[PDB]
Amino acid sequence: IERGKFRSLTLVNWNGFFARTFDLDELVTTLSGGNGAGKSTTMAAFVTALIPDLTLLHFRNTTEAGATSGSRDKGLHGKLRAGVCYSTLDVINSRHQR
């Protein structure tokens, strides 16, 4: 059977990204750039698209991963710009449905 795949990830009005669509790879997609480029932002946006449960979403730094920082902020709000924002996934199903 042909397993479904994640074609692309689209980010709208995000912090730094206005409307950017990264076309994902069949096996591996890599993101590079100096510190603060916004890779972690892309990961966070994806996972938000996957599990929009607001209680769970907590974007701690890679440092203090699971160490309580007492910031009281999940970090998602500062990753979005004012106004509307979108985070979407295109998936090709094993039934070849987009």
Binding site: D25, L27, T29, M43
Partner: protein, 84 residues
């Protein structure tokens, strides 16, 4: 998890598979090659991040650069290729 849900799901659908790895620079070349071979053997998609391009000859790659611009920010994305 996939195996357990094999009954409820239809016979014609195989669920998508995808994982992440931030700060990939913590892994060396050998470890990353092993991870790549494992993921491809398991048909597992991976999204990896590292300040330097640690996987130049496999999958697709992007490079992001943040520019201050008229008192706000913009991220510019450029594709990368193995050879030139």
């Amino acid at each position: 998890w996939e195996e357990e849900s094999r009954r409820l799901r239809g016979k014609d659908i195989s669920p998508c598979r995808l994982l992440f790895l931030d700060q990939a620079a913590r892994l060396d070349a050998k470890s990353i090659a092993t991870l790549f071979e494992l993921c491809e053997r398991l048909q597992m998609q991976l999204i990896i991040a590292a300040p330097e391009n640690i996987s130049p000859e496999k999958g697709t790659t992007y490079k992001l650069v943040r520019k201050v611009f008229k008192n706000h920010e913009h991220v510019h994305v450029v594709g990368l290729r193995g050879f030139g």
